[PDB]
């Protein structure tokens, strides 16, 4: 009898798909891991469940607890969804530059939203949450950028899904970095198992903080937070690639139009990088996995579609 008790048992176990047309100049094989096959259509559903389960198991949730989280949208949607199922009160801080679909979804799940200034980006969404936390003891702030449960769920689920599904043949994993939980969790398991495996972090050209540049405003929602997240393990990352806004957008569009994969802006960015890596002679016949974080329907109000 395969019936989930609730929506939290429905996270993960996402499919890999081979790219066929969006492969210009590739000498390696590129397969995309499709994270919109999650119950609220993003990779972050994984951490939304995981961070709350961790809290529950450590006895951190009280009857009057209010969940408070800084988000660029998807974690907020993930927590709002888990809170709907659980019966928890949930508040999100989020920059006002994020897609209007994120705002509407948050509300639709009965969560509450506080918009932070767009010039301050993710750093300022964090501050408002940390600032609200100290006004009232009822707040519990998971804090995805610091929470061990974030990369942990990726070890336990994402990494094993990638390993099993490629039958250990995976050679390189390309992934945009927001909190860096995805790339870190996957590298933690796969790199120990297969020390030849390599891990490429992707970040906006317009905000290249990991590459040692200064932060800046960009449309690549979900990544380029503007600081080095505590949760990322940079010792496991083998290469950083920065992607321009226009490339990220164009490739996002080609995936929809050439592959039938309607994905968000950060998935275009990860694929630009996966393609670049796949053109290197030394990677001929290797297997590359690019993580595609979410669905493009969340972006209709953005310039991805206009």
Ligand X SMILES: Cc1ncc(COP(=O)(O)O)c(CNC(C)C(=O)O)c1O
238 binds a second copy (CB under 8 A): no
- From 58-66, 78-86, 212-220, 270-278, give the range in contact with a second copy by CB under 8 A: 78-86
177 binds ligand X (CB under 6 A): yes
Other C-beta atoms closer than 10 Å to the C-beta of 15 total 12
Under a CB-based contact definition with an 8 Å cutoff, are residues 35 and 275 in contact?
no
C-alpha of 106 from chain center: 17
How far apart CA 157 and CA 79 sit, in angstroms, is 18
Least Å from the CB of residue 256 to a second copy:
5
Q: 3-state class of 184 per DSSP?
A: helix
Q: Which of 217, 152, 141 minimizes the C-alpha distance to 184?
A: 152
224 binds ligand X (CB under 6 A): no
Q: List C-alpha distances in Å: 55 to 52, 58, 67.
A: 5, 5, 11
- Eight-state DSSP code of residue 14: P
- 128 tagged catalytic: no
Q: Which residue is nearest to ligand X (CB)?
A: 222
281 to 300: interface string for a second copy, x by CB under 8 A: --------------xxxx-x
267 to 296: interface string for ligand X, x by CB under 6 A: --------------------------xx--
List binders of ligand X among 38-57 (CB under 6 A). 42, 44
How far apart CA 34 and CA 223 sit, in angstroms, is 17
Q: Which of 102, 32, 30 minimizes the C-alpha distance to 261?
A: 32
Please pick, from the candidates 47, 50, 98, 105, the single residue that binds a second copy as defined by CB under 8 A. Answer: 105
Interacting residues toward ligand X by CB under 6 A: 42, 44, 71-75, 176-182, 222-223, 264, 266, 293-294
Interacting residues toward a second copy by CB under 8 A: 1-10, 15-18, 20, 31, 34, 36-37, 39-41, 81-85, 101, 104-105, 107-110, 164-167, 169, 253, 256-262, 295-298, 300, 305
């Amino acid at each position: 009898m395969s019936i989930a008790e609730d929506i939290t048992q429905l996270i993960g176990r996402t499919p890999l798909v081979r790219l066929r047309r969006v492969t210009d100049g590739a000498v390696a094989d590129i397969v995309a891991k499709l994270e919109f096959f999650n119950p609220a259509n993003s990779v972050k559903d994984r951490i939304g469940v995981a961070m709350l389960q961790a809290a529950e198991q450590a006895g951190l949730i009280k009857p009057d607890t209010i969940i408070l989280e800084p988000t660029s949208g998807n974690t907020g949607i993930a927590l709002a969804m888990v809170c709907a199922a659980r019966g928890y009160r949930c508040v999100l801080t989020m920059p006002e530059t994020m897609s209007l679909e994120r705002r509407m979804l948050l509300r639709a799940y009965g969560a509450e939203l506080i918009l932070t200034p767009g010039a301050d980006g993710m750093s300022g969404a964090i501050a408002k949450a940390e600032e609200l936390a100290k006004t009232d003891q009822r707040y519990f702030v998971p804090q995805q950028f610091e929470n061990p449960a974030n990369p942990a769920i990726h070890r336990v689920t994402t990494a094993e899904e990638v390993w099993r599904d490629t039958d250990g043949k995976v050679d390189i994993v390309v992934a945009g970095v927001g909190t860096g939980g995805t790339i870190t969790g996957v590298a933690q398991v796969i790199k120990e198992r297969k020390p030849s495996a390599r891990f490429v972090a992707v970040e906006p050209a317009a905000s290249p903080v990991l590459s040692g540049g200064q932060k800046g405003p960009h449309p690549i929602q979900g990544i380029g937070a503007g600081f080095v997240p505590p949760v990322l393990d940079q010792d496991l990352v083998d290469e950083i690639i920065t992607v321009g806004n226009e490339d990220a957008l164009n490739v996002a569009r080609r995936l929809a139009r050439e592959e039938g994969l309607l994905v968000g802006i950060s998935s275009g960015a990860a694929t630009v990088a996966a393609l670049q890596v796949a053109r290197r002679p030394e990677n001929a016949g290797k297997l590359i996995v690019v993580v595609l974080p979410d669905f493009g329907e969340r972006y209709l109000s953005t310039p991805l579609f206009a």
